[PDB]
PDB file of N, CA, C and O in Angstrom:
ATOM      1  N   UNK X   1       0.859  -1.218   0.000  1.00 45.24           N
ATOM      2  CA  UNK X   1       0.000   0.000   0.000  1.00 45.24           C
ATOM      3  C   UNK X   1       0.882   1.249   0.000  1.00 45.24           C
ATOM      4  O   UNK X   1       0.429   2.210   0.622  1.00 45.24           O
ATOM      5  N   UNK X   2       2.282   1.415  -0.705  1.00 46.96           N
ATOM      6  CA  UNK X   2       3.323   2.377  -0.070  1.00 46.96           C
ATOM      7  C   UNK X   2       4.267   2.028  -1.727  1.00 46.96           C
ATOM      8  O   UNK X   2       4.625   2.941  -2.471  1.00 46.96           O
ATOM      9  N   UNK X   3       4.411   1.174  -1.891  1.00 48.14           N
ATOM     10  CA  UNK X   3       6.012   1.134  -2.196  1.00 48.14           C
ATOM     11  C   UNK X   3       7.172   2.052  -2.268  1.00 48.14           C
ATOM     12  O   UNK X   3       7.503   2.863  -1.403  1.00 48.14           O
ATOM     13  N   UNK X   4       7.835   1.791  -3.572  1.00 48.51           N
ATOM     14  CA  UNK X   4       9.101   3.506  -3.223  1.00 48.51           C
ATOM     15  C   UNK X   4       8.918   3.616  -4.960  1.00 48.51           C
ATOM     16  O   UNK X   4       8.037   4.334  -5.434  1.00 48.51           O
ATOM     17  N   UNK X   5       9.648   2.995  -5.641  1.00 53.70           N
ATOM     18  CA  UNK X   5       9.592   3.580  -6.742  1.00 53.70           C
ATOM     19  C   UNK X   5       8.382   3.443  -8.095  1.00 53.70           C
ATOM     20  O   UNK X   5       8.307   3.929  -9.223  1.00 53.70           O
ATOM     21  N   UNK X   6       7.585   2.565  -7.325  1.00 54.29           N
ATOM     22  CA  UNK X   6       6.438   2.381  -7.953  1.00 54.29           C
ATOM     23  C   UNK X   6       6.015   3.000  -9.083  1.00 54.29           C
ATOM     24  O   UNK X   6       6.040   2.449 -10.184  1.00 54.29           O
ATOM     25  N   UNK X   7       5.455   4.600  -8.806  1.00 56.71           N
ATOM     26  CA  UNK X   7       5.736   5.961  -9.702  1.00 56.71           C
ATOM     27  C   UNK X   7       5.916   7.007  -9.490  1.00 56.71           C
ATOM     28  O   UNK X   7       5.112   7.939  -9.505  1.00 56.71           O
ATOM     29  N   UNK X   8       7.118   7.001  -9.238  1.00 57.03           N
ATOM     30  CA  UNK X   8       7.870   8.338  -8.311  1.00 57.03           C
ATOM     31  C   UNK X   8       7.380   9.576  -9.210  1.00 57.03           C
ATOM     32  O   UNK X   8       6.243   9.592  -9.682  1.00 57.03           O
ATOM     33  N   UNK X   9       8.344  10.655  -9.428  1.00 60.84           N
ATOM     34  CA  UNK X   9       7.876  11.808 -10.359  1.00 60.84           C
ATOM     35  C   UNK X   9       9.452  11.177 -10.817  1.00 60.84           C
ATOM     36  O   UNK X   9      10.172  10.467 -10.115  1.00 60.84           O
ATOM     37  N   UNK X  10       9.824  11.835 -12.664  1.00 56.32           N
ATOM     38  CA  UNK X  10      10.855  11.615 -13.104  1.00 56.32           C
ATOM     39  C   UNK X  10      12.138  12.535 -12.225  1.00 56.32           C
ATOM     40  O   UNK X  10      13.348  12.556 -12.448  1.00 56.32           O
ATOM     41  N   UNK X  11      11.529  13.080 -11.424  1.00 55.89           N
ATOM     42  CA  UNK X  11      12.767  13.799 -11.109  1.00 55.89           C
ATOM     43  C   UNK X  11      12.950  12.732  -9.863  1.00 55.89           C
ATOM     44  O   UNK X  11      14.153  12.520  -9.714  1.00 55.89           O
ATOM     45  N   UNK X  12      11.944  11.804  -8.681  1.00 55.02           N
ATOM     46  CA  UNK X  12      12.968  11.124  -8.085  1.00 55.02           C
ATOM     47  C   UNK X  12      13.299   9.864  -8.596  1.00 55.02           C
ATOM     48  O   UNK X  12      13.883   9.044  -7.887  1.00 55.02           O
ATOM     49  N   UNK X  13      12.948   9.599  -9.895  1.00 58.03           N
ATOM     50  CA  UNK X  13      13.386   7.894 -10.006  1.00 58.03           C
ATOM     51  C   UNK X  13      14.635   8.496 -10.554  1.00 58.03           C
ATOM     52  O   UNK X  13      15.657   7.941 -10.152  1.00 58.03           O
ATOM     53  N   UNK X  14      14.794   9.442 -11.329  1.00 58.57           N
ATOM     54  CA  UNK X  14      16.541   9.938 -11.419  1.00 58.57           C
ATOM     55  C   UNK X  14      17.444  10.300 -10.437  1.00 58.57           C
ATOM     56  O   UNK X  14      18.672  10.367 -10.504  1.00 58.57           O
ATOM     57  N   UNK X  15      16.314  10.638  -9.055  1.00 59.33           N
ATOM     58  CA  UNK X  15      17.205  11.104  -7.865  1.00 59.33           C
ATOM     59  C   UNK X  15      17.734   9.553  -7.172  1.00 59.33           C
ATOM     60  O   UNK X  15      18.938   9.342  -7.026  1.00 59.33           O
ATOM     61  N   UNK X  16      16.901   8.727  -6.854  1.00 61.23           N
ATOM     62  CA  UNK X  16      17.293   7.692  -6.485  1.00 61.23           C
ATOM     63  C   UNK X  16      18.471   6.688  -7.271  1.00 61.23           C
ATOM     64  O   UNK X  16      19.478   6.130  -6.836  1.00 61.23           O
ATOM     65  N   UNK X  17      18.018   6.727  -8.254  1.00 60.44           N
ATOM     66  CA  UNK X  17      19.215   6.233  -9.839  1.00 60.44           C
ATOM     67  C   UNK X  17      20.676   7.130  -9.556  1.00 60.44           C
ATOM     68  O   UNK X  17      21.871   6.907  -9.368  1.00 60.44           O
ATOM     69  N   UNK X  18      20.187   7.731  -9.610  1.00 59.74           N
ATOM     70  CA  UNK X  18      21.824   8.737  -9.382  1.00 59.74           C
ATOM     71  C   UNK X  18      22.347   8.187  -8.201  1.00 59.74           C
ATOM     72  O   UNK X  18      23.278   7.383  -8.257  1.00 59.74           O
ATOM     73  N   UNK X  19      21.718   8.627  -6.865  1.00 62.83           N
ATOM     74  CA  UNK X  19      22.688   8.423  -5.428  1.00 62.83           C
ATOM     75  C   UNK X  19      22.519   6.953  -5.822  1.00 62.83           C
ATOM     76  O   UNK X  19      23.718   6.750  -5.632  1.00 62.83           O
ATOM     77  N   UNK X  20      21.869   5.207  -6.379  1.00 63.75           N
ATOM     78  CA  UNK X  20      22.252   4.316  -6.518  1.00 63.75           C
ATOM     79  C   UNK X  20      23.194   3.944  -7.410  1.00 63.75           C
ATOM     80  O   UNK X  20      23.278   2.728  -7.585  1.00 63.75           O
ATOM     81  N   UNK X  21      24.215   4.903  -8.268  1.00 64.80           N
ATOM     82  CA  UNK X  21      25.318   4.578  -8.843  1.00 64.80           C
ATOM     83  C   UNK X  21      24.665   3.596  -9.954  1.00 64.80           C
ATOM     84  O   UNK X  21      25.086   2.492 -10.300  1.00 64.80           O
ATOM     85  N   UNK X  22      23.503   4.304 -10.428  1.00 68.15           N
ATOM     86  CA  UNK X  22      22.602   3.609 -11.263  1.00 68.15           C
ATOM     87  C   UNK X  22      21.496   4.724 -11.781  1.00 68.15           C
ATOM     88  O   UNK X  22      20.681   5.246 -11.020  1.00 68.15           O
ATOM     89  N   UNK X  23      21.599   5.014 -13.227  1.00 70.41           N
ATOM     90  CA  UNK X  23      20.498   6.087 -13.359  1.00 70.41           C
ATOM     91  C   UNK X  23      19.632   5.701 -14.220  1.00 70.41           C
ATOM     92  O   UNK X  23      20.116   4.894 -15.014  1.00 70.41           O
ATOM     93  N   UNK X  24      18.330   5.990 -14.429  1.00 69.48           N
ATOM     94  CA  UNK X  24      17.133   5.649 -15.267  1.00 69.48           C
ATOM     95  C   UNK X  24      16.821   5.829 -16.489  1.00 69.48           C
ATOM     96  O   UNK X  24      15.883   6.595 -16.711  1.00 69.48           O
ATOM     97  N   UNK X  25      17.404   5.280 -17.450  1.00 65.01           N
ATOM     98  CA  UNK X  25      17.085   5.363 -19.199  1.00 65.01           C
ATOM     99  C   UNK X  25      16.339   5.055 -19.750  1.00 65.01           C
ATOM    100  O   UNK X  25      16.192   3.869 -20.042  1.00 65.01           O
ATOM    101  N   UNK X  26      15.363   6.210 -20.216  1.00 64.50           N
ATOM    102  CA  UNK X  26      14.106   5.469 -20.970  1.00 64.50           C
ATOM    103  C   UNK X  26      13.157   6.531 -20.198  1.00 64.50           C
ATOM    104  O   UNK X  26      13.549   7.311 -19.330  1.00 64.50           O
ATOM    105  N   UNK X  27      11.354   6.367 -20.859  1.00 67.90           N
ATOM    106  CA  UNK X  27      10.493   7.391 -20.613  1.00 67.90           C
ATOM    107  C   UNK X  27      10.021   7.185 -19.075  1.00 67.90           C
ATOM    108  O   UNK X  27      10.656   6.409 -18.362  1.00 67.90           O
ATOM    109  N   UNK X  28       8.972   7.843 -18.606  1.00 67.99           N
ATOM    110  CA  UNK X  28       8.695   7.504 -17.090  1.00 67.99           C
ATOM    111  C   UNK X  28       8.513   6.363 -16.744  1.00 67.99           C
ATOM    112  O   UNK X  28       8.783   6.048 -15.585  1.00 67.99           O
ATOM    113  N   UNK X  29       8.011   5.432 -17.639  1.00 72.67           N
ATOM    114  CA  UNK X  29       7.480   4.125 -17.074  1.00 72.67           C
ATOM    115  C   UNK X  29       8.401   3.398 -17.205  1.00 72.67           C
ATOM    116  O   UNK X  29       8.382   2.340 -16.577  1.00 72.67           O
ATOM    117  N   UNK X  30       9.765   3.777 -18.248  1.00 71.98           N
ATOM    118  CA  UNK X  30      10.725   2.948 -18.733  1.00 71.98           C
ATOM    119  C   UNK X  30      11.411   3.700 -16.958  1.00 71.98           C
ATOM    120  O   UNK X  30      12.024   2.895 -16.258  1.00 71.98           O
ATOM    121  N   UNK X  31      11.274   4.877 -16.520  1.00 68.64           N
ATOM    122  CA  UNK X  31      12.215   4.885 -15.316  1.00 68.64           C
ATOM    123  C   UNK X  31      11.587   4.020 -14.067  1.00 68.64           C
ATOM    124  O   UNK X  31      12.349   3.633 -13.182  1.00 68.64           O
ATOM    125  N   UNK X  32       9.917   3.670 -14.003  1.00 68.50           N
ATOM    126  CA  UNK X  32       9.373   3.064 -12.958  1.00 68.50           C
ATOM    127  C   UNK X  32       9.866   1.146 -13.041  1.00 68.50           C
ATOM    128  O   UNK X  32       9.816   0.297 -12.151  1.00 68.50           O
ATOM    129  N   UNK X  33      10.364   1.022 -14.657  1.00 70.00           N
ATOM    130  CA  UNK X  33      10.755   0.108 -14.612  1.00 70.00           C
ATOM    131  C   UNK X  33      12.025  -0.274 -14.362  1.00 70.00           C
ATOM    132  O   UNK X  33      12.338  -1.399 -13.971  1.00 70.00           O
ATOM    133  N   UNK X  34      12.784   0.637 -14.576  1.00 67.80           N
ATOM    134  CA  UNK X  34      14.369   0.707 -14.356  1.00 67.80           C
ATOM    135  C   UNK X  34      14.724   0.458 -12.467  1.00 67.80           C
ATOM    136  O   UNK X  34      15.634  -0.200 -11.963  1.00 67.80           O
ATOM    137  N   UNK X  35      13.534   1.326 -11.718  1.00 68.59           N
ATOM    138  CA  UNK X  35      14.212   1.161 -10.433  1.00 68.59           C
ATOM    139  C   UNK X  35      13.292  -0.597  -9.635  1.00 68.59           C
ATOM    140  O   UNK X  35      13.833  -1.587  -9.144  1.00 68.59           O
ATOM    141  N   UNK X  36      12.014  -0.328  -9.815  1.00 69.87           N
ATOM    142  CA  UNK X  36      11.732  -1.712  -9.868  1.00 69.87           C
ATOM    143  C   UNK X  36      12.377  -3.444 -10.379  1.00 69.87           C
ATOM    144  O   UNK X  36      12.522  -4.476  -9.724  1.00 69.87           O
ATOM    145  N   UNK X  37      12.661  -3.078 -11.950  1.00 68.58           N
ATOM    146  CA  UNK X  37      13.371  -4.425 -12.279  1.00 68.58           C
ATOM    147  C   UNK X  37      14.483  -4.283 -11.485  1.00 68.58           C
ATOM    148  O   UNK X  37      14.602  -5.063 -10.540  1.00 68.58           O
ATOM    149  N   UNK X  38      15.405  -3.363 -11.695  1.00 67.84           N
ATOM    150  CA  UNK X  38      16.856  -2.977 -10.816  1.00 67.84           C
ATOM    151  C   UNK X  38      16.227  -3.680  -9.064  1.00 67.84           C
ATOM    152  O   UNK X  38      16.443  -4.828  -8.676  1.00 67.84           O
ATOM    153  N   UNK X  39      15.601  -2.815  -8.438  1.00 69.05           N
ATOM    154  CA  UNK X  39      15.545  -3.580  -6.977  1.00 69.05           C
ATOM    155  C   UNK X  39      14.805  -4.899  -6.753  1.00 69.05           C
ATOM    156  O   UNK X  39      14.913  -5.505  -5.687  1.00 69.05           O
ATOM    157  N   UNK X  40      13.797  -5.488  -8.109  1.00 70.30           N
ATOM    158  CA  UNK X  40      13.654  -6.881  -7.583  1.00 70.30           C
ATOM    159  C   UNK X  40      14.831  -7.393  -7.662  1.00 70.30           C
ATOM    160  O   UNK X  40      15.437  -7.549  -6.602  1.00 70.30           O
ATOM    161  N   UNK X  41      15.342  -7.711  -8.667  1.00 69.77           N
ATOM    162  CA  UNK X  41      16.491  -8.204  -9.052  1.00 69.77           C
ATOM    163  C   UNK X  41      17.345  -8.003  -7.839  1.00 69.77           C
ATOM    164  O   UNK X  41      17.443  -8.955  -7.065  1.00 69.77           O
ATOM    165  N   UNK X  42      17.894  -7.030  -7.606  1.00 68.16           N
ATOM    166  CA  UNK X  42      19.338  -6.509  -6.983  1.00 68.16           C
ATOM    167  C   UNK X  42      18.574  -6.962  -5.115  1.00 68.16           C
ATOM    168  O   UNK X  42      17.671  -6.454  -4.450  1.00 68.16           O
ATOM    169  N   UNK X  43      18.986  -7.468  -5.012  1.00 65.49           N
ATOM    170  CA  UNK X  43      18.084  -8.017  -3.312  1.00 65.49           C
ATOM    171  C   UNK X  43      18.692  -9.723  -2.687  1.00 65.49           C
ATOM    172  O   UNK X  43      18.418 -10.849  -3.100  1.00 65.49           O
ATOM    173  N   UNK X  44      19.472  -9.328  -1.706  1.00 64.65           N
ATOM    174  CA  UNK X  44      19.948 -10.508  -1.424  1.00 64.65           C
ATOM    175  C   UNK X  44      19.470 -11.642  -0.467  1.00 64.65           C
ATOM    176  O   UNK X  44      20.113 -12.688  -0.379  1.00 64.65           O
TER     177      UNK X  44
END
């Protein structure tokens, strides 16, 4: 009921992308997908 990058505004899925040494390429949804696929994936 919260998540984080779900659908940020483009300015924080680039803010988060940036300070993660990882930035978001592609249109908004291509950035909601960038930090999503990136953090399912990236999770140990």
């Amino acid at each position: 009921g919260s998540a984080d990058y779900s659908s940020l505004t483009v300015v924080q899925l680039k803010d988060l992308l940036t300070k993660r040494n990882l930035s978001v390429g592609g249109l908004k949804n291509e950035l909601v997908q960038r930090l999503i696929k990136d953090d399912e994936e990236s999770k140990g």
